[PDB]
């Protein structure tokens, strides 16, 4: 009954959108209606995804409000599950987010984006996939702050549908069918063709944010709202990744250069995103480059899977796919944690620059603990949920390192070395982020005036962090659940890792020095926190603390050629009409035209 | 399945300031002075445990709670390193990625504790330590990765008994990876004044000294127990245990002595550590 | 702000609480085998500084008795004060006093630190180090010989006893 569940979920999403738009004359009631509708629709979406994943078969039917053909493969059930979780918690966050005198009623665009994303996940036609991913993308463009930020994203988004429309026309000419099961059963006879696959991969990476086509991501995540940016990073990226995965797995056939190309592409995405996140002092733009690097890690897992299905190694396929999809779900979880918590910090303070955002850990300690969990989850630290997917991806890398191929053995340990680079850089970046935001003395009078977080904001972020911890410690019980979608044995190289014993050994081991200091203390006075930091005799000043500007200097010191390569490959001055007076307003003017003419032809 | 890892962690915790004490008395004898005793580190640590911890007003729970976290993370490390058998006490936790990212946990908590205080010196030291971790983690990953693909499995107690029974057919990938791991250990135990602990005081400073001594133990132990296993057991017996403890403490003592000697005998070793690591990686690919 | 004053505003030596000052003997027998000493050089000539740094030199050693020089007041159990308290140096010396964990041991080193020395009655000094902070052990000399420094630290740690008395 997952078809009826997803039908009711899409119905509640569109009802929430139209009711939030109809009652837009006030902010509180419109936000309440939009959040409740999004929450119940996401509950139905997650219920349908869990039903499909537990059935492990795959269901098909017809959505009887668009006349929409639907197939829910168990591979897409993970996308439905993560969309349901993220949508439910972002809607519950939006309930309290829509009580501010500075924010806007975004519930119509939020609900339309989630409905388009769900219809894109559950799509069976590739043309309908493009159309619904294109509805979601224009709603996301409308979901930005102003017309300046949604200009490069509009250009890259329409470049992507030009590419995806050409690829879909090529597929319709070659096969006479746009369906996905029909293409899979027809791709035994003729293989995909590099010309269609590379075009589709570039067109989806324009949507999935793949370096060097990543220029829209931090500009879009510059000053957007946290309910906007959370589902941006956890929906818009994952739809393009789903399109890449459903183009790469369109047949058992898959040439070896596809997997190597995906490995190199996700590799440079992970490295460049993780390096470029270090040199930024805006939290919501830093999270965009960390989106880029974790999407690179998920693409590393998917490229390992594609290389395995090229080399006919079932263990490699199993390891690559579940590592990639588990890291996809976990990344969406803790990225929602990070974006919603940073938005709560902005909600209580008003600042997004971490240079002018210190001392928030004492003002809001619940939010501070939640971001500590999220930062330790994103920088892959055991036993949290960002470590398990990286562990399975490393196991797939080791399976690559032992397979018989010169293109795979040369690429085996290099991916491990660079993923160690990326993990260490992420650990540094989140050490910097937690140090200069939630620790130390505040650096602005606007910071100490920030009271505690609201009720439902804290409830949503704590529930997301609870889900992150649950997905972390219960990885050995959730990985075989994802083995029901990618369907075959998981074969780590003679090794398991067990998150519960690390969890038990990280709470019980620090008790031993506590017991020892409780025994070895004699006349120990109670600990005092009174004075200022020791700065060698002179008194302490606000200009003397080291912050994100001075903490990210040796990475600018040692990784200088890549950061100068940022400035070189920037063809922004070569576009003739890019410097126009009204080009930003013109793109948003045809955006109203394009969404109005493409929605009505579907209906 | 509980007693062996717990006794492993407890003994490796309780023997850690011997290695710091022997290192500081070796540095004293190398500079032609008599120097302190080998038990001076214990006296300093217990005396600091007597004192009471102070900190800045802006410091919160992270500043007080970091040293216990770092000691517990080093204990979770040390409970999976084999010191007397070729089999790790906890093979579930005794992977390669697990140990690396638990060391990443330690680096992250040290860096956020250095940034918690308002002192520029502690934040600078946190940044330098994080730089050191960024430059050393893939070196050691590639070293034990070459050793792992020589072995067949991503797991301690598989690399250890692969290098225990020397195959004599892939000896060059083993030797180059061994020297790369030695270089990574040399970088981690060393640099490669004010200090990053200038804001710690009392019990917090004592538990930081505990954690630093335990980190310097477990890095050298991950070298000399994984890559020098001749003297350990395939299966745990009750009669050959004294020989295993003797050879383990002798290995640790000679390791800290020779590392102190070659530290005082001093991006060359940073590049050569990467260079011997890639020379290991090319060696399997060419042969 | 940092230090107590009179009605005129002249600084006075700090008074520790007796709860804080009650466990000084226990602190001394705790740090008898390991003493962490921070030099707090104030307004004085290098003589009273180089000789203190010569207590860990080849001729006279301090680590054999357990004394180790620390880089921060937070690590310090003994605060070694050196020079006569210059008006520009009272505030950093007070800051080094409050930065150390309670209880503390203070040792005045040299004539200039004990009472001001030759600059005892002068507008830019406050006199000796006892005019700003309490002092437990006084070590005279200008400069004190390293034998006197070792005797002062050993008598502070209880390894030796006081030799000279008043007449
Ligand atoms: S005691 Fe003598 S040597 Fe020391 S600072 Fe005073 S005048 Fe100089």
XYZ file of N, CA and C in Angstrom, chain C residues 14-78:
195
model
N 47.960 41.709 48.968
C 46.737 40.922 49.008
C 46.691 40.055 50.260
N 45.475 39.746 50.696
C 45.238 38.878 51.843
C 44.475 37.654 51.356
N 45.128 36.492 51.394
C 44.443 35.259 51.034
C 43.466 34.868 52.137
N 42.460 34.086 51.754
C 41.481 33.609 52.714
C 42.266 32.569 53.511
N 41.824 32.349 54.752
C 42.444 31.311 55.581
C 42.052 29.854 55.207
N 40.914 29.749 54.517
C 40.505 28.472 53.942
C 41.545 28.210 52.861
N 41.889 29.234 52.077
C 42.892 29.073 51.027
C 44.286 28.900 51.627
N 44.577 29.610 52.713
C 45.901 29.579 53.321
C 46.068 28.466 54.347
N 45.011 27.706 54.634
C 45.082 26.673 55.659
C 45.854 25.437 55.215
N 45.903 25.152 53.914
C 46.505 23.926 53.406
C 47.873 24.156 52.759
N 48.580 25.209 53.179
C 49.907 25.480 52.630
C 50.918 24.411 53.034
N 50.836 23.909 54.270
C 51.752 22.855 54.704
C 51.507 21.555 53.944
N 50.236 21.225 53.709
C 49.901 20.052 52.908
C 50.350 20.220 51.460
N 50.223 21.431 50.909
C 50.745 21.693 49.571
C 52.261 21.541 49.531
N 52.948 21.988 50.586
C 54.402 21.862 50.651
C 54.839 20.403 50.705
N 54.178 19.589 51.533
C 54.534 18.174 51.574
C 54.060 17.430 50.328
N 53.107 17.996 49.584
C 52.733 17.427 48.294
C 53.787 17.715 47.231
N 54.315 18.939 47.205
C 55.251 19.350 46.162
C 56.689 19.208 46.649
N 56.877 18.478 47.753
C 58.221 18.225 48.269
C 59.078 17.464 47.262
N 58.501 16.470 46.590
C 59.250 15.671 45.629
C 59.152 16.188 44.199
N 58.286 17.166 43.932
C 58.152 17.713 42.583
C 57.573 19.116 42.700
N 58.380 20.126 42.388
C 57.975 21.520 42.502
C 57.968 22.162 41.124
N 56.873 22.841 40.799
C 56.714 23.550 39.534
C 56.818 25.043 39.821
N 57.906 25.661 39.367
C 58.259 27.024 39.743
C 58.209 27.911 38.507
N 57.503 29.034 38.614
C 57.410 30.021 37.545
C 58.136 31.287 37.978
N 59.150 31.683 37.213
C 59.850 32.934 37.483
C 58.967 34.111 37.092
N 58.749 35.026 38.034
C 58.043 36.266 37.741
C 59.019 37.421 37.909
N 59.682 37.790 36.823
C 60.703 38.852 36.870
C 60.003 40.188 36.848
N 60.359 41.055 37.785
C 59.691 42.354 37.877
C 60.758 43.384 37.580
N 60.705 44.518 38.249
C 61.633 45.597 37.902
C 63.021 45.427 38.446
N 63.766 44.469 37.890
C 65.095 44.203 38.450
C 66.152 43.989 37.416
N 67.426 44.034 37.806
C 68.616 43.828 36.947
C 68.806 42.360 36.611
N 69.413 42.076 35.475
C 69.488 40.673 35.010
C 70.190 39.749 36.023
N 71.040 40.330 36.849
C 71.746 39.515 37.840
C 70.793 38.574 38.543
N 69.628 39.094 38.953
C 68.690 38.305 39.784
C 67.836 37.420 38.890
N 68.108 37.422 37.601
C 67.386 36.629 36.611
C 68.267 35.542 36.007
N 69.508 35.882 35.650
C 70.405 34.901 35.044
C 70.835 33.859 36.069
N 71.044 34.281 37.320
C 71.409 33.338 38.372
C 70.267 32.381 38.691
N 69.020 32.848 38.588
C 67.876 31.957 38.757
C 67.793 30.974 37.596
N 68.113 31.434 36.383
C 68.185 30.534 35.238
C 69.413 29.636 35.292
N 70.418 29.999 36.089
C 71.592 29.163 36.297
C 71.371 28.094 37.358
N 70.188 28.050 37.976
C 69.865 26.985 38.917
C 69.616 25.651 38.229
N 69.417 25.646 36.909
C 69.324 24.423 36.122
C 70.521 24.255 35.191
N 71.615 24.952 35.470
C 72.801 24.938 34.626
C 73.670 23.732 34.964
N 74.815 23.586 34.289
C 75.715 22.468 34.617
C 76.324 22.555 36.007
N 76.608 23.761 36.508
C 77.247 23.892 37.814
C 76.286 23.532 38.942
N 75.068 24.067 38.898
C 74.048 23.788 39.900
C 72.782 23.332 39.194
N 72.218 22.218 39.650
C 71.050 21.617 39.024
C 69.853 21.676 39.963
N 68.668 21.847 39.374
C 67.424 21.897 40.125
C 66.486 20.735 39.840
N 66.601 20.085 38.680
C 65.740 18.950 38.368
C 66.098 17.710 39.177
N 67.319 17.639 39.715
C 67.683 16.523 40.581
C 66.931 16.574 41.904
N 66.514 17.764 42.330
C 65.687 17.932 43.515
C 64.202 18.005 43.190
N 63.831 17.932 41.911
C 62.444 17.935 41.498
C 61.926 19.256 40.966
N 62.701 20.331 41.074
C 62.255 21.649 40.626
C 62.328 21.716 39.106
N 61.197 22.028 38.474
C 61.119 22.215 37.032
C 60.470 23.561 36.745
N 61.086 24.340 35.861
C 60.563 25.654 35.501
C 59.435 25.484 34.493
N 58.302 26.130 34.759
C 57.104 25.990 33.933
C 56.919 27.221 33.054
N 56.259 27.100 31.897
C 56.057 28.266 31.030
C 54.833 29.110 31.339
N 53.957 28.673 32.236
C 52.718 29.380 32.505
C 52.480 29.424 34.006
N 51.833 30.482 34.505
C 51.428 30.489 35.920
C 50.426 29.404 36.265
N 49.633 28.943 35.291
C 48.654 27.892 35.549
C 49.319 26.586 35.963
N 50.533 26.330 35.482
C 51.269 25.140 35.881
C 52.024 25.325 37.189
N 52.040 26.531 37.746
C 52.959 26.855 38.827
C 52.388 26.499 40.192
N 53.228 25.877 41.018
C 52.979 25.733 42.444
C 53.794 26.701 43.280
N 54.932 27.153 42.762
C 55.781 28.141 43.409
C 55.937 29.316 42.456
